Amino acid sequence: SQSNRELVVDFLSYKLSQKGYSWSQFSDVIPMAAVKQALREAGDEFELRYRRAFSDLTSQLHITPGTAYQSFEQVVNELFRDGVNWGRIVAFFSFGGALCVESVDKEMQVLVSRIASWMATYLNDHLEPWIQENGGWDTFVDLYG
């Protein structure tokens, strides 16, 4: 639940470093070490294998500081049109990474912590039930670690 915001911030921080951006927007107010790394790896493999994979989806959202959670939720739900997967869960984290990158390119660095919040919310409401049902994050480590 709050480990979840823990994993969201790790992933986004990692992607922003990777690309030459600042990561200081976050938190600007070991158990999951295996999960965090597995996720980092999974996201990297995903993006290698699909470069421009969220063009449409980001274009649909078009974030600005006036965007609300509901438009985010609505567009994220497109990833999950057939239900939850480990693969669609990895795509969700990449999608969030691509939005934070897009926000920083538009000189809207404020959105980055908003996006993390949104992601943690969404993960907690719609994705945790399925993760719980399908082995928790241990299963995730098993398959991607």
Curated annotation (Swiss-Prot):
Keywords for this protein: Apoptosis, Cytoplasm, Cytoplasmic vesicle, Cytoskeleton, Endocytosis, Membrane, Mitochondrion, Mitochondrion inner membrane, Mitochondrion outer membrane, Nucleus, Phosphoprotein, Synapse, Transmembrane, Transmembrane helix, Ubl conjugation
Motif (BH4): 3-23
Motif (BH2): 129-144
Motif BH1 per record, residues: 78-97
SS bonds (residue pairs): none
Sequence motif: BH3, positions: 35-49
Tissues where the protein occurs: Expressed in most tissues. Bcl-X(beta) is specifically expressed in cerebellum, heart, and thymus. In the ovary, the predominant form is Bcl-X(L), with a small but detectable level of Bcl-X(S).
One GO biological process term: regulation of apoptotic process
Domain of life: Eukaryota
Physiological role: Potent inhibitor of cell death. Inhibits activation of caspases. Appears to regulate cell death by blocking the voltage-dependent anion channel (VDAC) by binding to it and preventing the release of the caspase activator, CYC1, from the mitochondrial membrane. Also acts as a regulator of G2 checkpoint and progression to cytokinesis during mitosis. Isoform Bcl-X(L) also regulates presynaptic plasticity, including neurotransmitter release and recovery, number of axonal mitochondria as well as size and number of synaptic vesicle clusters. During synaptic stimulation, increases ATP availability from mitochondria through regulation of mitochondrial membrane ATP synthase F(1)F(0) activity and regulates endocytic vesicle retrieval in hippocampal neurons through association with DMN1L and stimulation of its GTPase activity in synaptic vesicles.
Free-text note regarding domains: The BH4 motif is required for anti-apoptotic activity. The BH1 and BH2 motifs are required for both heterodimerization with other Bcl-2 family members and for repression of cell death.
Protein family membership: Belongs to the Bcl-2 family.
Subunit: Homodimer. Interacts with BCL2L11. Interacts with BAD. Interacts with PGAM5. Interacts with HEBP2. Interacts with p53/TP53 and BBC3; interaction with BBC3 disrupts the interaction with p53/TP53. Interacts with ATP5F1A and ATP5F1B; the interactions mediate the association of isoform Bcl-X(L) with the mitochondrial membrane ATP synthase F(1)F(0) ATP synthase. Interacts with VDAC1. Interacts with BCL2L11 (via BH3). Interacts with RNF183. Interacts with GIMAP3/IAN4 and GIMAP5/IAN5.
Name by which UniProt lists this protein: Bcl-2-like protein 1
